[PDB]
Design a protein around this ligand. Sequence first.
Ligand SMILES: C[C@@H](O)[C@H](NC(=O)c1ccc(-c2ccccc2)cc1)C(=O)NO
Ligand SMILES: [Zn+2]
Length: 301
Amino acid sequence: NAMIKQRTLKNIIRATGVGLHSGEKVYLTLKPAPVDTGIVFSRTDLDPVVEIPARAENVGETTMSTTLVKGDVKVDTVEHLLSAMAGLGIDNAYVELSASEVPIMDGSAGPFVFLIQSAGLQEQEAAKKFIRIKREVSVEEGDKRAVFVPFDGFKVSFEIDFDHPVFRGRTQQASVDFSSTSFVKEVSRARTFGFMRDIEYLRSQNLALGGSVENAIVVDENRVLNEDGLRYEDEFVKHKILDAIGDLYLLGNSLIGEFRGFKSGHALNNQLLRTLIADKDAWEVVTFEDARTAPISYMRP
Ligand SMILES: C[C@@H](O)[C@H](NC(=O)c1ccc(-c2ccccc2)cc1)C(=O)NO
Ligand SMILES: [Zn+2]
């Protein structure tokens, strides 16, 4: 008789930071929103205020980060904040930003999960809608691949392939089944990362202006440059899982299914969502009026 309900924020919560790509200072405000609103970004620095729903149809650029666009108005680097929202099961929220990029914080979803849980969650008087994968859907480009597989729960598998001394062994693949593994404990703290030769190229072009060892793992030709080391033995692949969860949440609803990524990035993740949405026979919308019968579990609000 206990139904799985939609969730929003119990209180407003505020954060400040800098954009990884733009280097601009930005004020972030997360606000409660009504049932069936979904996640909506709002550029409050503009006149009039521009709202951009966090949906696959509004993705505009996918080079290095996922960017939402509406006309000429952009919201860059939404993936880590959306991963935190998805991890905590937030259905409805307003995300107000004073600039064109979500703050990078420490490069992970950790600060966002903590800010959300500090504000608390509010269950709403409406059933949470899930998108259930009924048939396999895959997208490929070159040697990159991203797949949705029917699965009674939610599971993300990812494999990276870097021919580099730091990237050897079993730490290049990971699978997380959220029926037994905690998004907060095992995925949320995984930071973004960049290779020194790529970073140098980006800096030569006056790009990635906000990036440093304070908000990213920096790896040169042989080692991790961050003095204090890694948060997980497999932090790099866990961050790709974090990215995939955030990019997947642009479907607008939590998924019941499995994602498998092989060298996939924001572009291929978004192509997978667009293929799934277009293949209506591959999915269905489902609700759980009895939480006992559900294959996905959310933490108490
Ligand atoms: C891991 C990869 O998918 C991506 N991150 C980057 O592309 C990236 C690019 C540049 C930096 C960087 C780090 C330090 C200084 C300058 C740039 C960090 C991450 C990412 O996390 N997208 O969400
Ligand atoms: Zn990322």
